[PDB]
Amino acid sequence: SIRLPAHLRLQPIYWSRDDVAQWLKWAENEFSLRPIDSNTFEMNGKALLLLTKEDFRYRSPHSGDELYELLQHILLGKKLLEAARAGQDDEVRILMANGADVNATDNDGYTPLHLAASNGHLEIVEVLLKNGADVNASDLTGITPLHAAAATGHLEIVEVLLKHGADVNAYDNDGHTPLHLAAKYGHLEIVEVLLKHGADVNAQDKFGKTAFDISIDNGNEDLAEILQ
């Protein structure tokens, strides 16, 4: 599969010169390509998109087409991220049928399964889990799709995640578990199903607060009483 370094996962329309340069450098090692002068592609990412494959070919008689098609590949990863967010089930099909890597990542570590579980698109989450989307991938803040699905209240999505291997005791960079965010947003039934599949109700975050305490600070006392 294909995975940009952390500094290149942004949309290429947003790349600077140096990003474009870092991308060329990166591509040269990954795919095992002959070293070229980056001043050939002397332009920011917004201009790179305007180039034709021939323009790629004549700049790099030895790797121009591969870089053109490589670029095209990452570009579909963004349209897949977008197709999984807006709920565009058809667009998710065409892109996965044209080769979309179902574990792409943007600048925020979001995968297409993160966005489809955070926004409530049950069909996309299932067709992503069926074609190999990582169920326990964590973004740069550590939020898993079960974090996003439990923080937003999507019960049928929290349950489908638990059915394919979603970790119920995953800790984020701030220490929060899926039972913490379900308590933060007042979703008792998700706290129920989380507590059914093995959620450590006594998990502590980096400030020392439990699911009871988050239910206290946010105003969910009926939930705070059920955890007590």
Is residue 17 packed enough to be buried (19+ CB in 10 Å), middle (13-18) or exposed (0-12)?
A: middle
Q: In terms of domains, do 153 and 127 share one?
A: no
Domain count, the chain: 2
The identity of residue 107, as a single letter, is N
- The residue with tokens 């699911």 is 211
Range of the domain at 62: 1-134
Separate counts of helices (H) and strands (E) for the chain:
13, 0
DSSP code per residue over the chain? -----TTT-S-GGG--HHHHHHHHHHHHHHTT-----GGGG-S-HHHHTT--HHHHHHH-TTTHHHHHHHHHHHHHHHHHHHHHHTT-HHHHHHHHHTT--TT---TT---HHHHHHHHT-HHHHHHHHHTT--TT---TT---HHHHHHHHT-HHHHHHHHHHT--TT---TT---HHHHHHHTT-HHHHHHHHHHT--TT---TTS--HHHHHHHTT-HHHHHHH-
Q: How far is CA 110 from the centre of its chain?
A: 2
Is residue 98 packed enough to be buried (19+ CB in 10 Å), middle (13-18) or exposed (0-12)?
A: exposed
CB 111 within 8 A of CB 125: no
Nearest to 133 by CA among 119, 151, 115: 115
What determination technique applies here?
X-ray
Q: How far apart are CA 129 and CA 134, in angstroms?
A: 7
DSSP letter, residue 41:
G
Neighbour count for residue 105 (Cβ, 10 Å): 20
Q: In terms of domains, do 124 and 182 share one?
A: no
Q: In terms of domains, do 75 and 100 share one?
A: yes
Q: In terms of domains, do 2 and 49 share one?
A: yes
CATH of the domain at 4: 1.10.150.50
User: Of 134, 167, 201, which residue sits at a domain end?
Assistant: 134
Please state the φ and ψ torsions of residue 142, each to the nearest 5 degrees: 90, 5
CA distances from 161 to 29, 136, 197, 198 (A): 36, 9, 11, 14
Q: How far apart are CA 145 and CA 167, in angstroms?
A: 10
Q: In terms of domains, do 185 and 104 share one?
A: no
Q: What 3-state DSSP class applies to 161? A: helix
Neighbour count for residue 121 (Cβ, 10 Å): 23
